[PDB]
């Protein structure tokens with residue numbers, strides 16, 4: 001409804017003083033044999049109706065920052081930049097589901113190259129992770145055409161072919 | 162005749178009165194019970210100024226004891242004169258200010274002042290005609306700082322043209338007995354400049370020097386410190402109680418001793434003061450007392466009067482004297498020390514002669530001065546104030562009680578104008 005709006009005034013100042021190199025799912029996602037990637041769920045319509053405040057920056061392709069409000073020893077507001085160098089930093093807006101493909105591509109090779117290519121899905125409750133591996137990708141009724149496993153379980157027969 | 166309401170605030174203030182109310186009753190000869198047993202009848206002539214009558218020959222002091230926040234209370238009741246106050250006048254509350262101004266003036270005062278201001282109007286209409294509102298408290302602390310200034314905002318509102326004296330024990334510039342002591346000074350004086358007719362600015366370090374350097378005392382207790390202050394109070398209302406050949410109203414002081422409606426911050430003084438057995442090697446005359454009164458080490462102000470300029474002084478003399486000696490000694494001081502005073506004021510001294518001394522003495526006096534030497538004191542506090550506020554030191558005990566940042570800037574610039582407009586008049590112009 002109306003939380004402290006100056007909370008958001010603290011946020012936007014770090015934004016309009018820097019470069020920002022966003023990251024989308026329309027680029028060759030190179031290989032390393034190892035990684036830990038990121039993908040967030042979009043802000044819901046309800047959260048907007050309750051005026052939930054942004055908490056993230058996506059300044060780079062391999063780094064993310066959190067916007068934590070804090071207080072000083074005179075009740076003066078302070079903001080923290082939780083600088084987290086990572087490998088892959090995808091946005092909640094860029095969910096085209098090629099993230100799995102971009103994650104599958106190195107792995108779809110390995111077993112067919114004779115190797116042990118494994119993974120794990122890690123995330124908080126309500127963070128959209130059942131929408132991230134168990135499929136399907138519509139976000140409405142889980143329409144049985146976009147099983148996220150099938151995006152490389154296709155490869156199980158197609159890259160076999 | 163005119164009568165006086167007496168109010169006490171703070172832990173300091175009622176401890177002052179607890180000795181002080183013993184002095185007045187001994188000045189007239191009144192038991193712990195209220196049975197008058199004085200010697201003459203001349204002390205009976207103005208009982209009414211403080212004491213009203215009761216049923217069987219009993220006299221009741223019109224003292225409204227606001228500051229009995231309950232720890233201080235029972236000590237007053239279990240004192241020498243706990244059996245002399247009307248017990249319904251013990252107006253108090255619970256869980257006091259705790260040396261917080263906003264807990265004295267903004268939160269717990271609102272839960273007590275309606276129980277106080279009514280009891281004011283009780284003793285008010287039992288008087289024929291009023292002038293006297295003697296608030297006895299201190300700065301620096303709690304109840305005397307926030308709950309004390311609350312009544313002075315209110316009783317001025319119900320009584321716009323009555324004499325308002327507050328005998329406020331000021332902070333000390335070196336011996337700091339309170340961590341928040343500049344934060345209680347700046348706020349409470351901001352009330353005092355607005356709505357007081359006069360005040361008796363008193364320090365303890367000045368009381369420390371007098372008890373030790375002059376009275377030669379080993380261990381001064383707070384009953385003995387305040388007994389010096391109790392000597393000031395009874396000396397001023399001497400002429401409103403006793404017939405004098407040159408009388409002294411509070412308003413006779415409060416037209417003479419004040420040039421300008423804001424500058425009414427007084428320093429007291431008293432003489433004789435000596436250390437002896439019963440043989441002391443001196444002799445009481447008019448020039449005997451006179452030189453003692455004007456001494457820089459005989460001030461209750463903790464400042465050098467020679468550093469500032471006396472605007473005006475008040476010599477309230479008691480006992481049998483001779484007016485020419487009184488006149489010429491006040492004349493000779495203004496002659497030999499003319500560079501000290503405010504030069505562009507025709508006479509810099511007035512006199513006041515009562516005809517009755519106290520019990521033990523044969524003569525006495527009471528100095529009241531108003532100087533640009535008190536320009537030092539607020540400078541010695543506002544500098545202590547302004548170091549705390551820039552680092553924003555103790556704000557979360559004040560902003561969490563109902564205060565504001567803009568209130569503090571408003572508070573000191575009041576006090577910054579007094580020291581500014583004492584520099585205008587300490588200058589030779």
Ligand SMILES: CC(=O)O[C@H]1C(=O)[C@@]2(C)[C@H]([C@H](OC(=O)c3ccccc3)[C@]3(O)C[C@H](OC(=O)[C@H](O)[C@@H](NC(=O)c4ccccc4)c4ccccc4)C(C)=C1C3(C)C)[C@]1(OC(C)=O)CO[C@@H]1C[C@@H]2O
Pocket residue numbers: 183184187188376384385386387388389391392395396433434435436437438439519520521522
């Ligand atoms: C033998 C003799 O003359 O003794 C004097 C005495 O020695 C001296 C030192 C007295 C003595 O005073 C003190 O030592 C003292 C103690 C605490 C606080 C202040 C003073 C005296 O105690 C104090 C006492 O004062 C009075 O009697 C006044 O009436 C005085 N009374 C009180 O303060 C008082 C004390 C206890 C109970 C009730 C009242 C007074 C002053 C102004 C207004 C009203 C009353 C006097 C003259 C003396 C003694 C007894 C030694 C002095 O004080 C006064 C107030 O007179 C201290 O310097 C003066 C000079 C006196 O000569």
Ligand SMILES: Nc1ncnc2c1ncn2[C@@H]1O[C@H](COP(=O)(O)OP(=O)(O)NP(=O)(O)O)[C@@H](O)[C@H]1O
Pocket residue numbers: 040041042095124125126127128129130131138139140
């Ligand atoms: N990346 C996304 N894009 C768009 N909508 C999403 C996304 N992730 C989740 N949603 C929607 O958010 C809602 C909750 O997602 P869901 O996957 O059911 O949450 P969950 O993490 O499984 N919660 P829970 O089972 O209660 O522990 C659903 O309506 C989804 O369609």
Ligand SMILES: Nc1nc2c(ncn2[C@@H]2O[C@H](COP(=O)(O)OP(=O)(O)O)[C@@H](O)[C@H]2O)c(=O)[nH]1
Pocket residue numbers: 170171172173174176177258259260299300301302303304305306330331332338339365383386387
């Ligand atoms: N002269 C004098 N000063 C006192 C006395 N008691 C406390 N003080 C001073 O009063 C200030 C502390 O305030 P206090 O009255 O005790 O706090 P309160 O009960 O909250 O009003 C300090 O500056 C103390 O030095 C006293 O009995 N006599």
Ligand SMILES: [Mg+2]
Pocket residue numbers: 130
């Ligand atoms: Mg689920």
